[PDB]
Structures are given as structure tokens and as C-alpha cells.
Design a protein around this ligand. Structure first.
Ligand SMILES: Cc1nnc(-c2ccc3occ(-c4ccc([S@](C)=O)cc4)c3c2)o1
Length: 341
């Protein structure tokens, strides 16, 4: 009700703060960082989330520094940011009301399967945001279904939560206990710290596969139990596999559970061939997010007529930028279909 008025710097553009007014603040989430609110900007009527972190006062916020570099339609945009209170950094973000987690669980609670057309849309917009994120050498490191925001009506997916993303410095090592356990790549559990952006892709597989199965593919009861779960679907990792993951542990030996069966009968051939492609031991083996997009599974989305179950056209899926294409520029004719040139 009470309209709060702050002095806020636009997320992008020149550092020139404006008076921004918002009201109807309610809490919609919280964690170690702090709290997320939903508010209504008084002047555009538009809804926003406000992530209230806690700023090390005498330290530069990594998330803030990362959000500013970022403008992509499948990523929650940092519209503004301000400070308040000792001292809290506030990120004013796009609000989107649903998450893949919550959608995936409604289906699962009702023992149905999320329509493959939604799996496609959502996974594609996910590989997109990462192709973009990774082109800057920024690893998300918490790719999990509740960091995927969805618009029920328009089928837009926006990646959110960069509260543990990092500009990866090759030659520079990092922390290995990151990601949500179920979505955490094997090398991470192995103690690797020399890792790459492939870890995000493993998380995507973990998602892809959970959308298909209606439950987490690898559900460990702890950091270490996690690898036991991966193991029972892929088997054990071998020389160049463990090599590739990290240059200790103590587990048991198990056989390679065939893919085209880890799921259910009606599951599409390409989706299965996707995961097998993602969910891979060696990290150089996992496909690239851009390269992922390319792969068949998403072909239906390259069909000129495709529409949303509710008869609307698909959200804008081909508005690529060269910044977005940077990684692998020679592959547009198979990512941009004619009808969008
Ligand atoms: C953590 C964290 N970092 N960003 C967010 C964030 C940002 C923008 C956002 O817009 C809507 C949400 C959102 C908040 C709560 C929910 S609940 C679990 O259904 C769903 C969606 C949101 C969350 O959360």
C-alpha cells in the first residue's frame, strides 16, 4: 500500500540515478543473500521483483557487476538497482510469476507429463540464455528448475538468480561445492576447481531429463551420495573420464545403464539423444549450449507455423545477436530459419 520512493541507478546505460516509486511490496522468497519481493512500479504499473541482498559495504558485489553486463530476453533483466537500510544492495528485476519447478511438479503431482512442446520451448530458451551467458565467459553455476522463470500465457522463459554466477578466469580455479546437488556435475563432486562452463550444460541435461521423467534423474541424499546416483545411470567413469574431470575418493563399480531406456517408452528419440549428449562424464564431451539448440530435438520450433497450445505464436526465438552467436558464428542457417530474416 505505502508507496516507497528510492533513488535508483538504471541497470544499463549511464550511471545516473532516478527517483523510482513502487508499492505493494510482498515477500516472494528468501535465502542466504537476503530476500526477494514483488512490487508494482507506480508509474508503469509494471510488476517487478526486488532482490534485497546485503552488501559487504567495503566490497564490490559480483552479482550486481554481472547483471549490468547483461541484456537478453531469456534472462531476468536488471532494470534498476539501489541501496538501503547496515547496507543492502537492491536489484530491481523483471518479475515473471511461474517457475519450471512448480510447473514440472503440478504435472508430476497429477501424474501426467509436461507436453514435449513445452519441454522444447523451455530447454531452447534455456540453451539460449547460456550460449549468451557463456559467450561472456560467465558461468551460472546454479542451473536448476527453480531458477527458470516462466510466463504461463506467453511461454517465455527467463533465467534468474546470478547470486553464484562467476566470470570464469581460465588459469584461475574455483569452488567445487556449488550448484544444487541434483544438478551438480560429476567433476564438481569430484573436487575439481579447474572447471568450465560445461557444468551448466550438465545442469541443463539434469533439467531436460527431469522434465522427461517427471522427477530428478540423479537424486542423492547428500553431496557424496549424489555421485552414487549419477553412477547408477551412466556406470563408472574411466581413466580419461576421471582424468577429464580433474587431475582420493572411494566408490563401488557399476555397469552402463543404456540410455534409450532410462526413461519411458513414449519419450522422443532426439530428447534421449540430447541428454546422452549433455549428461556426459568428460566435460569437454558435453555439447555447447549453442550447439545444443542446433540439435534436432528443437526442430519443431524451427517450423514456420508452430504455435503455443493456446493458439498464440511462440515467443521470439530467433532474434539472435552476433554477441549471442559469437561462440560459433558459422551455424546461423541452421538456427535462423528463413521466415525470420
Ligand atoms: C534468488 C533469486 N535471484 N533472483 C530471483 C528472482 C528474480 C526475479 C523474479 O521474478 C519472479 C520471481 C519468483 C519468485 C518466487 C517464486 S515462488 C518459489 O513460486 C517464483 C518466481 C523471481 C525471483 O530470485
Amino acid at each position: 500500500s505505502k508507496v516507497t520512493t528510492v533513488v535508483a541507478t538504471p541497470g544499463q546505460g549511464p550511471d545516473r540515478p532516478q527517483e523510482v516509486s513502487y508499492t505493494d511490496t510482498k515477500v516472494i522468497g528468501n535465502g542466504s543473500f537476503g530476500v526477494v519481493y514483488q512490487a508494482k512500479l507506480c508509474d508503469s504499473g509494471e510488476l517487478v521483483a526486488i532482490k534485497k541482498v546485503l552488501q559487504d559495504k567495503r566490497f564490490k558485489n559480483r552479482e550486481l557487476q554481472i547483471m549490468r553486463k547483461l541484456d537478453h530476453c531469456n534472462i531476468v533483466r536488471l532494470r534498476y538497482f539501489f541501496y538501503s537500510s547496515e547496507v543492502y544492495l537492491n536489484l530491481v528485476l523483471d518479475y515473471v510469476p511461474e517457475t519450471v519447478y512448480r510447473v514440472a511438479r503440478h504435472y508430476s503431482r497429477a501424474k501426467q507429463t509436461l507436453p514435449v512442446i513445452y519441454v522444447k520451448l523451455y530447454m531452447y530458451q534455456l540453451f539460449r540464455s547460456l550460449a549468451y551467458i557463456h559467450s561472456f565467459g560467465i558461468c551460472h553455476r546454479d542451473i536448476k528448475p527453480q531458477n527458470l522463470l516462466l510466463d504461463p500465457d506467453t511461454a517465455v522463459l527467463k533465467l534468474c538468480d546470478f547470486g553464484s554466477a562467476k566470470q570464469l578466469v581460465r588459469g584461475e580455479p574455483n569452488v567445487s561445492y556449488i550448484c544444487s546437488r541434483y544438478y551438480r556435475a560429476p567433476e564438481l563432486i569430484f573436487g575439481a576447481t579447474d572447471y568450465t562452463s560445461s557444468i551448466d550444460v550438465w545442469s541443463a541435461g539434469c533439467v531436460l531429463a527431469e522434465l522427461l521423467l517427471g522427477q530428478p534423474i540423479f537424486p542423492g541424499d547428500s553431496g557424496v551420495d549424489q555421485l552414487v546416483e549419477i553412477i547408477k545411470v551412466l556406470g563408472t567413469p574411466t581413466r580419461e573420464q576421471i582424468r577429464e574431470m580433474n587431475p582420493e575418493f572411494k566408490f563401488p563399480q557399476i555397469k552402463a545403464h543404456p540410455w534409450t531406456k532410462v526413461f519411458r517408452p513414449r519419450t522422443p528419440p532426439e530428447a534421449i539423444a540430447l541428454c546422452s549428449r549433455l549428461l556426459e562424464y568428460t566435460p569437454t564431451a558435453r555439447l555447447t549450449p549453442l550447439e545444443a539448440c542446433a540439435h534436432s530435438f528443437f526442430d519443431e520450433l524451427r517450423d514456420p507455423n508452430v504455435k503455443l497450445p493456446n493458439g498464440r505464436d511462440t515467443p521470439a526465438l530467433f532474434n539472435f545477436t552476433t554477441q549471442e552467436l559469437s561462440s560459433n558464428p558459422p551455424l546461423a542457417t541452421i538456427l535462423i530459419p528463413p521466415h525470420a530474416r
